[PDB]
Symmetry: D2
Subunit: 324 residues, 4 copies
């Protein structure tokens, strides 16, 4: 029986102690504490001694919505991928393309209230309280077109059967920049799944390109086999899912194929009342077999832009020595 107690600033400011105190603070602070414990359990299982990716004792799936790549959480995710701390990525199309675009031009801070008419008149696109100039996408187009030319050529003459994961690996290799999530993912043989890869600017570009160079095919069937087999052949699995939608369901349903994940942490701002998959508590997933009945899953109800860097500080970044 753990008593409720907050951090006492009469101690001064020890940030480690402050973060530790979340566990006994209550409400979502307590859930954050539980999430730290669950992610540390995944890491410790992964470090136990026992696709071209070599198996470890715990396969960790990391999912995140596209806007988190628009955000500075791009840097957090890149760090985990760079150091081979997770095994599978799932993100929607924006989450792919904006990582690449950020190697060409930056995204800027703005405000949620900025009016669309005036932004559009000035060639600026709004993402929440962020701003992306039109020119960023012009640079993306210039960079991407010759790559898409090569991909079509390789498909039609070298027998390459493109899927989203294979395209994402290629784009990461091409961007050739260590600030990029997907550069690191391909270097470290971490596959990235994104079944609706056409839903975004990369889609726009594929679309425009296809009238100059028809023929590109992106198959989603083989990518389903690939993600599901990552779960089926795992010794243990953990799911860390930031946001909802496709990224959440796709990871959770892959884990249904092994009769459920062993560990699970959700950080999202959705709620159950609307019947949404996004908003479903981890315990809904237990009814399906996506999370094992004996698992102790955790959801933090919060914006991941606040919570994820703190979670990484207290988990993966603490075990940096073991990952090298």
């Amino acid at each position: 029986s753990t008593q409720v107690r907050g951090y006492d600033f009469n101690r001064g400011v020890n940030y480690r102690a402050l973060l530790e105190a979340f566990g006994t603070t209550g409400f979502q602070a307590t859930n954050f504490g539980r999430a730290v414990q669950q992610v540390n359990a995944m890491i410790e299982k992964k470090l136990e001694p026992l696709s071209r990716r070599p198996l470890t004792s715990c396969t960790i799936f990391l999912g995140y919505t596209s806007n988190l790549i628009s955000s500075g959480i791009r840097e957090t995710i890149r760090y985990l991928v760079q150091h081979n701390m997770v095994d599978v990525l799932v993100t929607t199309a924006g989450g792919v393309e904006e990582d690449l675009i950020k190697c060409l031009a930056p995204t800027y801070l703005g405000e949620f209230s900025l009016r669309g008419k005036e932004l559009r008149e000035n060639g600026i696109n709004r993402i929440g309280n962020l701003l992306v100039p039109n020119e960023n996408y012009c640079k993306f187009e210039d960079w991407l077109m010759p790559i898409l030319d090569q991909m079509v050529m390789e498909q039609n003459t070298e027998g390459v059967k493109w899927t989203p994961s294979k395209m994402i690996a290629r784009l990461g290799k091409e961007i050739n920049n260590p600030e990029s999530v997907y550069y690191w993912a391909q270097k470290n043989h971490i596959p990235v799944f994104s079944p609706a890869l056409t839903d975004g600017s990369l889609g726009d570009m594929i679309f425009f390109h296809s009238y100059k160079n028809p023929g590109l095919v992106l198959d989603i069937v083989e990518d389903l086999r690939l993600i599901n087999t990552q779960a089926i052949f795992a010794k243990c699995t953990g799911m860390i899912i930031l946001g909802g939608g496709v990224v959440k369901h796709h990871i959770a349903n892959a884990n249904l194929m092994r009769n459920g994940a062993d560990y699970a942490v959700y950080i999202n701002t959705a709620q159950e009342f609307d019947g949404s998959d996004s908003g479903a508590r981890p315990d809904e997933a237990v009814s399906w077999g996506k999370i094992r009945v004996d698992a102790q899953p955790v959801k933090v109800y919060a914006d991941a832009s606040l919570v994820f860097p703190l979670l990484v500080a207290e988990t993966f970044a603490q075990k940096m020595d073991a990952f090298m």
Copy 2:
């Protein structure tokens, strides 16, 4: 300047008057009233004849669906097909009231499965362990027996066999929309959304069609009968061309995610939708595309600067049937 005033029940339960009074009630009631006006504007435009010039341009797609003065995109999250909103959507599709559907994979498969076995009412709080032990799957406060998916497997597997054979011997290049049309034709049931969609030449887009039970089945099927391809590139061309060659467009988007962005992004290709109504429970603060206001879409060119879009912040299970009652259902005579 409009004064705030709610419906006065001293007048009795005059339902039409009650619904009209939402417009002057405030908060989301007022946004509902605005949504009714915006959808009625789409419908009024749709029923306007095409001039010679407009007909020429609108006829530049290869689809055999007859031309109207307003191409209406209807998007909905999968859970809304789990819900009774399935019946609302089916009605609109049955009577050619909308032109393009976008839904995620659950929103395809569960329409088909509901022709085989029903979904039941439950409660949000039911615990997963006991449900799993009794072979019941939870969708919010709804319940789907394991047996529903067994029936789906039995129905679907022979269709998947035919699809692979048609691919390999007849050169069929499958995409999600083509598969959804075929599944609708196969289910052959007037209670099905997708039966009516294919019958009425209304394309359905679902670029992550593998994300659900239909995916499970494709996956298992592929080990006995390998090589089925679902191309998403051709389907991107198809949805975007629906927007590009429209005289006007309206978007009616229930929920967020892929369904919302995919429709809105198609409309960027024509420099923006003329009309838009969002009904969703998302909020902007998290930076989500789901929670972005219509005015964010204006910055991108997905909604015209001159448009007067509306978002209703509510569960669509409450709002959508009311919206349809006051809009499409009022003009049903024109659609027959």
Copy 3:
């Protein structure tokens, strides 16, 4: 085992049938259906044959946040009070004052996005997507001051011991206008509780008045006795609570005094994750004894401006004959 099924518009548009179909539609539509059933159960219990208010077989407490009086839900609430359909009102201070102010000057439709600087420069105050001109409050001041003079005089010479409920009764009598909730409440001997009655424009006015005419006392202790005894001596109780905060807790805690309400319907947009009383599910209230263990309470997760008029249409307005 009830099957999920929505209203079939091939029937045409029968609004009664459409509303009935919410029950089998799922998510919050199903909760709305359950709410209709629970409120009808309250009404039917109230109509069973057995403070100056005569007891009925079910005492119904109606609570609502202040903004719902800013809204057109003012008209919905007024109707119920006018016809003696509920027994006790609880609202916060705005919910009192704006009912009175609306008899003097209207509130207007606006938009949530309107900027504060320009509104303030034009003498307009924003309430969500509503607008209240400064002049409305000038009219309120002119109307209220001579009443406050009388109240002080009655306190100091006729021994009147003012409380929020007594003040609200008096203001209702004074406004003398059948569009007013509180005019009807006092006419029908329905008490109104508002322990923080100073938190709003009526507060501002009491504050300004007190420097011209010092002495007014508003006691909250006697009003606690009054509300709690409404619950203690009831044969049965029902709670209908629109929104959260003081209005929700105050009604629910009164019902703790009788060991719990027999029926309960919440309609609010709050969520549990933040630990808020506003967001607590009805089942939290069961742990306290505020709702009986054998009750079947219902929460609808929605804006009451949408849901409440529909609920009244299917419940109280259907039994209009029995209430006359």
Copy 4:
């Protein structure tokens, strides 16, 4: 123009740098960074000396609390005292870092009760029937035993007897703030927020003080010892005068409801606060005062037009300790 960039953990776990990087991370991380800046602006102003002219005007209240160049109002919902945020608030009050407190009744009583018995961790999903049967009360994912309130009754009843006697024999005119000061003096415990508040002459306002357990006790007490009066009118004068005679004001408001409006409305009386930070989980769509953006308050004159207020959309149990770490705790030396 500031570029979006998150903290790079290749630099190691440098916590100060990690927290500073929230400002360029986007969404609510950026709003957190803005809140840190806004609170530090309040603190910097507070530590600025009062000029002769400013001192004269600021000294026009009867309170004996020493004058500062920025009067800081701290508001919090009751549940935040149920939580460990009680410790965060106590620290600020202990060291005279804020000037006026506003909380609802739970936020008073539970601070006192925590000196008598602890609150425990639980879970949101725990069912009410079984909790009730075991004499346990649920607050979100926290748990309070029945016995805690028995202990509160035993402690409080003799104090209520003294208060009634002082009213009737010494002419004491009780208000919520005066009662809260007395209860703080009586609890006589350095872990208590209200012990420190009364010691440091920080008034606490709670106009619905009867809405909770303290109310329960007053109610039961009144049948044995009738006639206790709690006047809310005098307390309105007292809070509003704190704003009217301030050189500058800042508002730090955790959660919504009475606590938020009461602080903001007091600041309308001086034509608006100079600085404001809201941390709450409410949204604007429902028309709620709780969910109104800071810019709504600008229309009323509760926040100055020239102010740059900030709302962080998050559970304060996560955000507030981080905010304090980066603001008040950094300047602790100046407050001693």
